[PDB]
Design a protein around this motif. Structure first.
Motif, PDB file in Angstrom:
ATOM      1  N   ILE A  25      -7.813 -12.668   0.706  1.00 55.21           N
ATOM      2  CA  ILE A  25      -7.355 -11.766  -0.351  1.00 55.21           C
ATOM      3  C   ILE A  25      -7.413 -12.392  -1.736  1.00 55.21           C
ATOM      4  CG2 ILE A  25      -4.822 -12.205  -0.120  1.00 55.21           C
ATOM      5  CD1 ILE A  25      -4.526  -9.050  -0.559  1.00 55.21           C
ATOM      6  N   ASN A  38       9.784 -12.624  -1.664  1.00 54.07           N
ATOM      7  CA  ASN A  38      11.198 -12.329  -1.371  1.00 54.07           C
ATOM      8  C   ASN A  38      11.939 -12.035  -2.675  1.00 54.07           C
ATOM      9  OD1 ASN A  38      11.615 -14.810  -2.597  1.00 54.07           O
ATOM     10  ND2 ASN A  38      12.361 -15.856  -0.774  1.00 54.07           N
ATOM     11  N   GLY A  44       5.807 -19.005  -0.972  1.00 50.05           N
ATOM     12  CA  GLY A  44       5.549 -19.800   0.232  1.00 50.05           C
ATOM     13  C   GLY A  44       5.028 -19.124   1.487  1.00 50.05           C
ATOM     14  N   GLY A  45       4.870 -17.806   1.430  1.00 47.95           N
ATOM     15  CA  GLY A  45       4.230 -17.035   2.493  1.00 47.95           C
ATOM     16  C   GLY A  45       2.762 -17.356   2.647  1.00 47.95           C
ATOM     17  N   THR A  50      -2.305 -18.891  -0.114  1.00 47.18           N
ATOM     18  CA  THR A  50      -3.745 -18.706  -0.407  1.00 47.18           C
ATOM     19  C   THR A  50      -3.994 -18.397  -1.882  1.00 47.18           C
ATOM     20  OG1 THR A  50      -5.844 -17.851   0.426  1.00 47.18           O
ATOM     21  CG2 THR A  50      -4.155 -16.183  -0.022  1.00 47.18           C
ATOM     22  N   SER A  96       8.885  -8.155   0.613  1.00 44.74           N
ATOM     23  CA  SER A  96       8.503  -7.793   1.962  1.00 44.74           C
ATOM     24  C   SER A  96       9.716  -7.752   2.896  1.00 44.74           C
ATOM     25  CB  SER A  96       7.466  -8.807   2.454  1.00 44.74           C
ATOM     26  OG  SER A  96       7.063  -8.520   3.769  1.00 44.74           O
ATOM     27  N   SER A 131      -1.853  -7.543   5.160  1.00 43.95           N
ATOM     28  CA  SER A 131      -0.918  -6.964   6.143  1.00 43.95           C
ATOM     29  C   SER A 131       0.522  -7.477   5.920  1.00 43.95           C
ATOM     30  CB  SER A 131      -1.422  -7.240   7.556  1.00 43.95           C
ATOM     31  OG  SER A 131      -0.640  -6.584   8.520  1.00 43.95           O
ATOM     32  N   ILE A 132       1.139  -6.919   4.880  1.00 50.06           N
ATOM     33  CA  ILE A 132       2.490  -7.268   4.474  1.00 50.06           C
ATOM     34  C   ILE A 132       3.421  -7.211   5.681  1.00 50.06           C
ATOM     35  CG2 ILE A 132       4.479  -6.560   3.037  1.00 50.06           C
ATOM     36  CD1 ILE A 132       2.365  -4.845   1.429  1.00 50.06           C
ATOM     37  N   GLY A 133       4.259  -8.238   5.815  1.00 46.26           N
ATOM     38  CA  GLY A 133       5.283  -8.310   6.862  1.00 46.26           C
ATOM     39  C   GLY A 133       4.897  -9.074   8.129  1.00 46.26           C
ATOM     40  N   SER A 134       3.599  -9.154   8.431  1.00 44.15           N
ATOM     41  CA  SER A 134       3.103  -9.669   9.716  1.00 44.15           C
ATOM     42  C   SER A 134       2.679 -11.156   9.709  1.00 44.15           C
ATOM     43  CB  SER A 134       1.954  -8.769  10.223  1.00 44.15           C
ATOM     44  OG  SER A 134       0.717  -8.998   9.526  1.00 44.15           O
ATOM     45  N   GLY A 135       3.040 -11.887   8.657  1.00 43.12           N
ATOM     46  CA  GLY A 135       2.903 -13.350   8.625  1.00 43.12           C
ATOM     47  C   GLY A 135       4.255 -14.006   8.798  1.00 43.12           C
ATOM     48  N   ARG A 136       4.756 -14.631   7.739  1.00 45.19           N
ATOM     49  CA  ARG A 136       6.062 -15.285   7.790  1.00 45.19           C
ATOM     50  C   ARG A 136       7.216 -14.334   8.124  1.00 45.19           C
ATOM     51  NH1 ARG A 136       4.345 -19.709   9.110  1.00 45.19           N
ATOM     52  NH2 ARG A 136       2.624 -20.445   7.772  1.00 45.19           N
ATOM     53  N   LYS A 141       1.420  -7.413  14.366  1.00 48.11           N
ATOM     54  CA  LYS A 141       0.266  -7.162  13.483  1.00 48.11           C
ATOM     55  C   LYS A 141      -0.290  -5.737  13.560  1.00 48.11           C
ATOM     56  CE  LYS A 141      -0.616 -11.896  12.460  1.00 48.11           C
ATOM     57  NZ  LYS A 141      -1.329 -13.193  12.668  1.00 48.11           N
ATOM     58  N   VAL A 170      -6.788  -5.659   3.500  1.00 49.98           N
ATOM     59  CA  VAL A 170      -7.488  -6.939   3.697  1.00 49.98           C
ATOM     60  C   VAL A 170      -6.928  -7.655   4.931  1.00 49.98           C
ATOM     61  CG1 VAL A 170      -8.256  -9.076   2.673  1.00 49.98           C
ATOM     62  CG2 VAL A 170      -7.768  -7.094   1.185  1.00 49.98           C
ATOM     63  N   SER A 176      -5.131 -10.027  13.741  1.00 46.42           N
ATOM     64  CA  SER A 176      -5.184  -8.774  12.976  1.00 46.42           C
ATOM     65  C   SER A 176      -6.591  -8.166  12.996  1.00 46.42           C
ATOM     66  CB  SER A 176      -4.751  -8.988  11.505  1.00 46.42           C
ATOM     67  OG  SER A 176      -3.364  -9.253  11.409  1.00 46.42           O
TER      68      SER A 176
HETATM   69  N1  LIG Z   1      -5.886 -15.550   2.729  1.00 45.09           N
HETATM   70  C1  LIG Z   1      -5.401 -14.434   3.308  1.00 45.09           C
HETATM   71  N2  LIG Z   1      -5.840 -13.183   2.965  1.00 45.09           N
HETATM   72  C2  LIG Z   1      -5.352 -12.062   3.513  1.00 45.09           C
HETATM   73  N3  LIG Z   1      -4.389 -12.040   4.448  1.00 45.09           N
HETATM   74  C3  LIG Z   1      -3.863 -13.236   4.857  1.00 45.09           C
HETATM   75  C4  LIG Z   1      -4.331 -14.520   4.308  1.00 45.09           C
HETATM   76  N4  LIG Z   1      -3.620 -15.493   4.906  1.00 45.09           N
HETATM   77  C5  LIG Z   1      -2.789 -14.885   5.785  1.00 45.09           C
HETATM   78  N5  LIG Z   1      -2.931 -13.550   5.736  1.00 45.09           N
HETATM   79  C6  LIG Z   1      -2.218 -12.482   6.460  1.00 45.09           C
HETATM   80  O1  LIG Z   1      -1.294 -11.927   5.493  1.00 45.09           O
HETATM   81  C7  LIG Z   1      -0.319 -11.183   6.257  1.00 45.09           C
HETATM   82  C8  LIG Z   1       1.053 -11.320   5.597  1.00 45.09           C
HETATM   83  O2  LIG Z   1       1.574 -12.668   5.663  1.00 45.09           O
HETATM   84  P1  LIG Z   1       2.497 -13.326   4.598  1.00 45.09           P
HETATM   85  O3  LIG Z   1       1.893 -13.729   3.292  1.00 45.09           O
HETATM   86  O4  LIG Z   1       3.192 -14.530   5.254  1.00 45.09           O
HETATM   87  O5  LIG Z   1       3.578 -12.164   4.213  1.00 45.09           O
HETATM   88  P2  LIG Z   1       4.927 -11.661   4.982  1.00 45.09           P
HETATM   89  O6  LIG Z   1       4.792 -11.611   6.452  1.00 45.09           O
HETATM   90  O7  LIG Z   1       5.292 -10.339   4.307  1.00 45.09           O
HETATM   91  O8  LIG Z   1       6.042 -12.703   4.547  1.00 45.09           O
HETATM   92  C9  LIG Z   1       6.292 -13.119   3.230  1.00 45.09           C
HETATM   93  C10 LIG Z   1       7.313 -14.236   3.373  1.00 45.09           C
HETATM   94  O9  LIG Z   1       6.944 -15.337   2.566  1.00 45.09           O
HETATM   95  C11 LIG Z   1       7.406 -14.999   1.264  1.00 45.09           C
HETATM   96  O10 LIG Z   1       7.407 -16.107   0.362  1.00 45.09           O
HETATM   97  C12 LIG Z   1       8.803 -14.526   1.554  1.00 45.09           C
HETATM   98  O11 LIG Z   1       9.647 -15.671   1.680  1.00 45.09           O
HETATM   99  C13 LIG Z   1       8.684 -13.833   2.887  1.00 45.09           C
HETATM  100  O12 LIG Z   1       9.648 -14.333   3.825  1.00 45.09           O
HETATM  101  C14 LIG Z   1      -0.382 -11.734   7.677  1.00 45.09           C
HETATM  102  O13 LIG Z   1      -0.872 -10.820   8.638  1.00 45.09           O
HETATM  103  C15 LIG Z   1      -1.322 -12.930   7.600  1.00 45.09           C
HETATM  104  O14 LIG Z   1      -1.975 -13.139   8.853  1.00 45.09           O
END
Ligand SMILES: Nc1ncnc2c1ncn2[C@@H]1O[C@H](COP(=O)(O)OP(=O)(O)OC[C@H]2O[C@H](O)[C@H](O)[C@@H]2O)[C@@H](O)[C@H]1O
Length: 185
Positions: A25, A38, A44-45, A50, A96, A131-136, A141, A170, A176
């Motif tokens: 992205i 947050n 830090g997500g 990235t 998120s 994909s907001i929410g599905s990482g940290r 997913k 993206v 995903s």
């Molecule tokens: N380079 C990238 N490009 C696109 N998508 C990506 C990339 N790297 C990871 N992802 C995908 O982005 C999606 C969202 O992940 P996060 O950025 O971790 O966002 P989220 O799950 O909403 O958590 C955010 C967390 O970190 C923040 O700082 C805040 O503390 C919150 O707890 C996930 O499916 C992940 O696999």
């Protein structure tokens, strides 16, 4: 990256285009890219990192500037920083929701729509969502993707005046990407 694959395209209500794309992205040249964060604009997500990678200090300093002027970010809230150091013009930051928190699925859809609203407010023509929410934040997913895509579709129903012509969803991580293709598109 600079990997970019269009996986699908869909016409929205008034002919706006929703593209599901495979890419980092941070590399996308849209008017906005969306950063899930947050209340305190934490960088830090997975996407934040990235962006940090790509944009460096100039990015970090843009987020800081925003953090000062804005104060704490309400839940589901969206705010915008200059995309200094990035291909994107602007970064839209959203609070998120966390998987397992109350009404987190509703909040995810609200968060998406608030980002679109903010892009419209800035008269932007394109906006890329990870994909907001599905990482940290721990959303499954498939569920994250469903809720985001549904929210996007819903925003454009009956809207006449939106500036937004192209929305990118993206996908980067392989779970995903696989889920999306495995089903349809
Ligand atoms: N380079 C990238 N490009 C696109 N998508 C990506 C990339 N790297 C990871 N992802 C995908 O982005 C999606 C969202 O992940 P996060 O950025 O971790 O966002 P989220 O799950 O909403 O958590 C955010 C967390 O970190 C923040 O700082 C805040 O503390 C919150 O707890 C996930 O499916 C992940 O696999």
């Amino acid at each position: 990256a600079d990997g970019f694959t269009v996986l699908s395209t869909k016409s929205l209500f008034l002919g706006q285009k929703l593209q599901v794309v495979q890419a980092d992205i941070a590399s996308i040249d849209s008017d906005a890219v969306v950063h899930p964060t947050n209340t305190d604009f934490y960088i830090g997500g997975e996407v934040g990192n990235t962006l940090e990678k790509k944009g460096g200090k100039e990015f970090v300093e843009a987020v800081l500037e925003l953090r000062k002027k804005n104060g704490p970010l309400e839940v589901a809230g969206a705010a915008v920083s200059a995309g200094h150091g990035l291909p994107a013009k602007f970064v839209i930051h959203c609070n998120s929701p966390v998987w397992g928190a109350d009404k987190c699925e509703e909040l995810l859809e609200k968060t998406v729509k608030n980002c679109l609203a903010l892009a419209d407010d800035k008269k932007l023509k394109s906006i890329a969502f990870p994909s907001i929410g599905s990482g940290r934040n721990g959303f499954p997913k498939q569920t994250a993707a469903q809720l985001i895509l549904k929210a996007i579709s819903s925003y454009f129903v009956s809207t006449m005046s939106s500036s937004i012509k192209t929305v990118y969803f993206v996908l980067f991580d392989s779970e995903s990407i696989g889920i999306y293709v495995q089903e349809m598109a």
